[PDB]
Amino acid sequence: KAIINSSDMQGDLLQEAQDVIQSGIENNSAPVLNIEAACKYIKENLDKKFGPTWQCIIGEGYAYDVTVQNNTLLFMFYNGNLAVLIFKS
């Protein structure tokens, strides 16, 4: 249940980002899951796929303030209440 909240990049990379966060959920889908392992997976996948200097962040209540390259930023929400930010720098 992906709910995109703020988009900056191109729709293809949008789709692949959603697919990768999904695959991360399945890699870690259990009460013992940690968002950190899925974060590692998201960032490393987007590195080996669309280049380095990616950054994955997952949570539900927090406050970031980061610098991002244009057309390389996404933030979104899940019906499962997972707010997921990703960005390249």
Binding site: G61, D65, T67, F75, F77, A83, L85
Partner: protein, 39 residues
């Protein structure tokens, strides 16, 4: 005189010109934003 008179000849090669031209690259630009995290 004894060997009969010789015959002049001519040959020259093709000589390209030397030009001095200099060009530039530039450091690509970058962006720096800041955003907050929503509920």
């Amino acid at each position: 005189r004894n060997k009969f008179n010789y015959n002049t000849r001519e040959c020259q090669t093709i000589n390209p010109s030397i030009r001095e031209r200099g060009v530039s690259t530039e450091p690509p630009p970058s962006d720096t934003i800041c955003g907050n995290i929503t509920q």
